[PDB]
Design a protein around this nucleic acid. Structure first.
Ligand SMILES: CN1C(=O)c2c3c(c(O)c(=O)n2[C@]12CC[C@@H]1C[C@@]12CO)C(=O)N(Cc1ccc(F)c(Cl)c1)CC3
Ligand SMILES: CN1C(=O)c2c3c(c(O)c(=O)n2[C@]12CC[C@@H]1C[C@@]12CO)C(=O)N(Cc1ccc(F)c(Cl)c1)CC3
Ligand SMILES: [Mg+2]
Ligand SMILES: [Mg+2]
Ligand SMILES: [Mg+2]
Ligand SMILES: [Mg+2]
Ligand SMILES: [Mg+2]
Ligand SMILES: [Mg+2]
Ligand SMILES: [Zn+2]
Ligand SMILES: [Zn+2]
Lengths: 368, 184, 368, 184
DNA sequence: TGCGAAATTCCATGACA
DNA sequence: ATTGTCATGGAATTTCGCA
DNA sequence: TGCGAAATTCCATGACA
DNA sequence: ATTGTCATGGAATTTCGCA
């Protein structure tokens, strides 16, 4: 815009240019003596190219791009133009890291009854023990009661074999698992349908969603580690020992063991509780029904100083699962279709696929 | 005297030899005395080692104060006596040729033998794969004397697999003829 | 102690046993009717074995071990005996995680002059580019001015070749690096001695100590990533471009580029600053000496709610560097010989070797 | 007129052919006009490609506003003209057969040629490895006219390698005899 | 002597694998 | 015998333009 | 009706690779 | 078409034993 800069040299006011400054012509270009020093005022038609040239030197953010521009030029609302370029730079949007934390975690309600929901997962590969490399961990959501199965692979065939032994005791309403090959197979879906079990899947690459079982994996590995100190890692024979030990371990916050929450009475194990000895099984089951309802439940923690919670229509970016060397950590922007809860969202990428993802695997696209 | 509780007494016994299924010939039957809950384990023999291998799986879930059995070789062995002593389990035997359990247990063991016979007929070599469904059926069977099924008494909740369709358990004239055909 | 329990059954007071309770004899053992229920009081000579039996079921901590014991027994100050056993259990001490955070980080003073201290490190392996897999990064501590060198390996030979090209410009007083094979070799020590350069090494497995260069590695990889979007990862030819781009990038907090801090004047690059055009080189160097002294310096942040700071004589445990599967994450206790600063310490393990370690790689041994 | 600054003008020239050292035969000499700072690069030839390869290393540290040279083929080529235009570098040439730089630069180039000659004598095939020490010596050499060395003027600090021992630079009767022996 | 807007400064967030 | 660092973009705070 | 000590409860820390 | 969890051991707080 050379017509815009023409009236300026003359001396009449233009919206955005402070009238208290001296706008002259020198070396064939419009200049202004500013407190910082003499700067060139480029015509509006040149500004986009200037911002892009400065930004492209090192793909700098707002202030670092501005500081370069400001060395030579001045124009009204320079950062508005810098931010407009930052918001259009695909390389910056997909490579830069987020600086906004996810909103506070949800503490999903504890399943009401034993067998309402099982959390399943695999531990491994572990050092070989009798040809076995993996452990299928099955944690009952209400009680925390765990079943352990040694496997040669994290497969559907091994999961089905293990769960047919477990389901001889009782059948769960739901089986929650991550999106591992063993659990997402059509053969596993078919196995569950046959039994009336609903399969629930965690959002991709979010093990916190399977937190109930993940946390038990920690305890299983910790005990196996302790029992194998200064001995070869022959864990196979220890699985039944670890299962029984953990199922009979008190949770200091609950003041109950997973066994007690499942049966309301201790079996013949060391230090069995004898407090319901004079009660009848019915009186004991009545007290168990009361204990199961009054267990402590944690609540969502405070949001951090700079958290973000999803909004329908918002431009958001999914995290690249296994990013290759020197490749962006983020996918191209997507739009939030449905907000399932403040931590789970349905997105539509540029491809056109609907993905249910955790907000931990998303960043809000910068500069709107 | 204190009231009867789950894990106070487990009644164990062997069923078999049965037609081979996945290389298995026997079924070790474990019944909790109080609740009437049944755990079934296929074995290749009624030996102390097969009893110990199977019971090591059960005792990784729950240990009984007492195990009751007849005077079968597998249960009277010094090896089985050592295994129990190690777990603080008292072994209890019935007098030879006089098998006494309890009304609830005797009745339960009858249902087990009859339900196995009913389902064997037609597919006598496919029972290994049926053991989980046999157990669910048995444990979700209503007890006329206690008002609750073994699942309810053990967990204190209703099951997700109620067995409303109370089947015959008695062999049909067709199943009787198909059963007598196998006995050849 | 059966003599101790004898006077109790009679009825005379014993220090530790509340006199308001009924201490009787039943089934050949001393019992007490407590609010919780009737508990067996074992003789002092049996207690250690009881605590050890309860603890060993699942190698439980204080409360979980206590809750088991309390099911059958009662005795004065039970937790004192539980904690005495927890403090003697080698398997728990070396396997359990710490629950005390390290003290707040130090913000070491910025080197006073360019060439006072160089921070060196390797980036790689990267996708092969002209047979090159690694990048030797040399960051001047004062200015932040970086030199980049492509290498085929993170070796002494490649480091020496690169630094002989760099040291043609100027020789540094100190070269700070981590304990990588390339820098700890006798050949490298010899190379530095020959030139009067002092070698300074970070504590083991603590890249934060090399933070100055680590942080530049982030910027180098970020720019390489951006420039290679939708192109094959041919980074070799981009190293000179990345070096020049980053050395001429403004730090928004300082409002200076590494080039400006090193030379006090911009070279012929885009958007060169022209503010010292009318000053003489001497006037310009005088202003540069003033800029270099007034740069912003961060201060140590607040300590977290539950941090720990080392003390001479304290029993502490070093973190296992590469712990194998099902093996403890901690070494056996060591003693703190010298507290170099609140974040660095000299320890003496059970072997008898003196190790200078970061407090981030230590946990204070539990239960004294 | 504005005061003289570092990076305002780089004076470039080739020294050689020299005896081969690590396959190298020439030295491209770059001298900053203001400070007198010297950068030396070994090349296998005085070609445009060798000039571009070497200057690509220097211009990754600092770009001059002007490059001054004589009318040597490597510097007058259209390829070298294109390379400079790309970096916003103005090429400046002296008139053929009339090489004019500056007092400070002419004096500096004399020191370079003489220091190289002094150190070549005895080890004429080991100069490649000596280029870093030659540069440090030259850049830490006190300027009688400016009161500061090229290192001080470029960085505005003292160096960690001061060159207090101001050596002869003139060839000894022994070095003169050893030099005339090589000329055979 | 105070208003609205632009400019600057602050600073949590996250990654150097 | 040593030790974290700093680009980033919303928010908070200060300064600017005008009166 | 209040003291000192023991017991219980709280809760940051860190790991499920 | 879903969602973090909880053992751990010092510190903070409540309860106990006695008066
Ligand atoms: C791609 N992927 C993983 O990387 C992975 C993990 C884990 C899995 O169980 C798991 O199945 N997977 C798979 C492999 C098999 C299947 C595709 C997968 C499903 O994501 C896993 O437990 N960890 C450990 C962990 C780290 C941090 C945490 F907060 C928690 Cl709670 C746990 C984290 C990595
Ligand atoms: C054993 N080891 C490493 O694991 C390692 C790292 C790194 C090295 O530079 C490095 O040299 N090493 C070596 C390999 C070569 C030599 C033995 C080593 C010295 O420790 C490294 O940069 N990262 C990235 C990183 C993670 C977290 C951070 F806070 C920071 Cl500041 C940086 C962390 C891992
Ligand atoms: Mg998994
Ligand atoms: Mg997992
Ligand atoms: Mg019999
Ligand atoms: Mg390194
Ligand atoms: Mg590093
Ligand atoms: Mg010449
Ligand atoms: Zn960009
Ligand atoms: Zn332990």
């Amino acid at each position: 815009l050379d017509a815009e800069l023409d009236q300026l040299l003359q001396g009449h006011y233009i919206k955005g240019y402070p009238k208290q400054y001296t706008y002259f012509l020198e070396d064939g270009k419009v200049k202004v003596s500013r407190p910082e020093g003499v700067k060139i005022i480029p015509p509006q038609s040149d500004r986009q190219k200037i911002v892009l040239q400065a930004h492209n030197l090192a793909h700098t953010g707002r202030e670092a791009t501005l500081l370069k521009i400001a060395n030579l030029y001045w124009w009204p609302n320079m950062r508005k133009d810098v931010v407009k370029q930052l918001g259009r730079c695909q390389q910056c949007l997909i490579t830069n890291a987020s600086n906004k934390a996810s909103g506070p975690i949800l503490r999903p309600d504890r399943p009401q009854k034993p067998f309402d929901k099982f959390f399943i997962d695999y531990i491994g590969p572990l050092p070989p023990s009798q040809g076995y490399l993996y452990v299928l961990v099955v944690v009952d959501g209400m009680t925390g009661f765990t079943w352990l199965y040694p496997t040669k692979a994290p497969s559907t065939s091994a999961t089905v074999k293990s769960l047919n032994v477990l389901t001889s005791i009782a059948i769960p309403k739901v089986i929650h698992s991550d999106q591992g090959a063993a659990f997402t197979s059509s053969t596993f879906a078919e196995w569950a349908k046959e039994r009336g079990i609903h399969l629930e899947f965690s959002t991709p690459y979010h093990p916190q969603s399977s937190g109930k079982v993940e946390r038990k994996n920690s305890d299983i590995k910790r005990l196996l580690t302790k029992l194998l100190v200064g001995r070869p890692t022959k864990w196979y024979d220890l699985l039944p020992v670890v299962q029984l030990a953990l199922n009979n371990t008190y949770s200091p916050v609950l003041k109950y063991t997973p066994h007690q929450l499942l049966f309301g009475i201790d079996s013949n194990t060391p230090f069995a509780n004898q407090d319901t000895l004079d009660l009848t099984r019915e009186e004991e089951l009545s007290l168990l029904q009361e204990i199961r309802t009054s267990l402590y439940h944690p609540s969502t923690p405070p949001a951090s100083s700079r958290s973000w919670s999803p909004v329908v229509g918002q431009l958001v970016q999914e995290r690249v699962a296994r990013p290759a060397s020197l490749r962006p950590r983020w996918h191209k922007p997507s739009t939030v279709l449905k907000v399932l809860n403040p931590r789970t969202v349905v997105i539509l990428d540029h491809l056109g696929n609907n993905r249910t993802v955790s907000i931990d695997n998303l960043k809000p696209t910068s500069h709107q | 005297d204190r009231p009867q509780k789950p894990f106070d007494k487990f009644f164990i016994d062997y069923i078999g030899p049965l037609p081979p299924s996945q290389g298995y010939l026997y079924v070790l039957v474990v019944v909790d005395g109080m609740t009437g809950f049944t755990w079934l384990y296929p074995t290749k023999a009624p030996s102390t080692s097969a009893t110990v291998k199977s019971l090591n799986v059960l005792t990784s879930i729950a240990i009984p104060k007492v195990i009751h059995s007849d005077q079968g070789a597998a249960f009277t062995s010094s090896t089985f006596a050592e295994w129990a002593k190690e777990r603080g389990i008292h072994l209890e035997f019935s007098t030879p040729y006089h098998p006494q359990s309890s009304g609830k247990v005797e009745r339960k063991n009858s249902d087990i033998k009859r339900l196995l016979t009913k389902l064997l007929v037609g597919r006598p070599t496919k029972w290994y794969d049926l053991l989980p469904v046999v157990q669910l059926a048995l444990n979700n069977t209503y007890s006329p004397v206690l008002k609750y099924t073994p699942h309810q008494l053990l967990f204190g909740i209703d099951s997700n697999t109620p067995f409303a369709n109370q089947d015959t358990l008695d062999l049909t004239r067709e199943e009787e003829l198909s059963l007598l055909q196998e006995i050849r």
